[PDB]
Design a binder for this molecule. Structure first.
Ligand SMILES: O=C(O)COc1cccc(CNC(=O)Nc2nnc(-c3ccco3)o2)c1
Length: 288
């Protein structure tokens, strides 16, 4: 049943790091501007736990300077208010985030010229962060998705090279293990889960922005190309709403897109369903 869930987009980058928090309703195609982040942020990740939206890491860059963010903030849709939470052990720009058992996992990202392979876990009910096992690879601009309590970190940049590799995190054993490498090198790709596959849409391969999209079926352990998006894009927002994948904005190598595309896995098609109120990349996106 359709209960009215919305797609939230937080922060992002256009001309500088943005504060913006907006919600889109796929049912009527309307947008609603909500309370601003207390601190502008691009390259952050967004996620939802217990009906609350969380903005994680990222960075604030403008003429007033460049500062990587270790912050965690919690937005309550019911009160339309942001609340500061406990910060991570380190600033994490171009971070990847995933949720398991109501816990927020902050993966990789960077702080200055430091490229994190480290990972830490946040427990809402205790407002406390905890270091877990580090990834086998240093990854900033990594994409993250979770399927059946297993977390996947896809692609990114290790400081020297851009990766087509990916790895899986086993939360209860607290380990990481490499999985099949993608067909394409991708950093800043949109990564999400839909049914039994992890999608890796767009990204930057080191020379061009990508509009190609491939998915990893956890059952067959293979990476498969599906239909390409209309726009190439890296640093795109991505989420799933009522069985379909939605990609928001990103950079196509020329413009900061306002375009929103929707992927229908049954017909293996993407189509443009709306536009953001303004183009932007590096947003955090989540559904509730
Ligand atoms: O590193 C990559 O290959 C892809 O770049 C990514 C990856 C993941 C998220 C993002 C979000 N983009 C982003 O934060 N862009 C941005 N942030 N600060 C700036 C900026 C530009 C000039 C001064 O500051 O541009 C980019």
């Amino acid at each position: 049943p359709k209960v009215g869930r919305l797609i939230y987009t937080a922060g992002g980058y256009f001309r500088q790091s943005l504060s913006y928090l907006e919600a889109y309703n796929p049912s009527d195609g309307t947008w609603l501007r909500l309370a601003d982040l207390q601190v502008p942020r691009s390259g952050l990740a967004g996620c939802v736990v217990g009906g609350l939206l969380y903005a994680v890491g990222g960075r604030n860059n403008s003429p007033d300077g460049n500062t990587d963010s270790s912050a965690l903030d919690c937005y309550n849709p019911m009160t339309n208010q942001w609340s500061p939470c406990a910060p991570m052990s380190v600033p994490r720009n171009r971070i990847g985030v995933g949720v398991i058992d109501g816990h927020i996992y902050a993966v990789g990202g960077s702080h200055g010229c430091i490229h994190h392979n480290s990972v830490e876990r946040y427990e809402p009910e205790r407002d406390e962060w905890h270091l877990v096992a580090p990834m086998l690879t240093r990854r900033i601009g990594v994409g993250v998705a979770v399927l059946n309590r297993l977390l996947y970190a896809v692609g990114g940049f290790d400081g020297t090279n851009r990766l087509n590799s990916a790895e899986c995190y086993y939360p209860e054993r607290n380990e990481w293990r490499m999985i099949t490498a993608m067909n394409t090198i991708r950093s800043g790709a949109g990564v999400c889960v839909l049914h039994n596959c992890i999608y890796a849409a767009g990204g930057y391969d080191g020379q061009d922005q990508l509009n190609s999209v491939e998915r990893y079926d956890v059952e067959t352990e293979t990476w498969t190309f599906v239909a390409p998006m209309k726009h190439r894009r890296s640093a795109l927002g991505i989420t799933v709403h009522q069985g379909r994948i939605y990609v928001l904005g990103g950079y196509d190598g020329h413009t900061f897109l306002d375009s929103v595309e929707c992927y229908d896995p049954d017909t293996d098609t993407w189509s443009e369903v709306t536009r953001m109120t303004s183009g932007r990349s590096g947003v955090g996106v989540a559904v509730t």
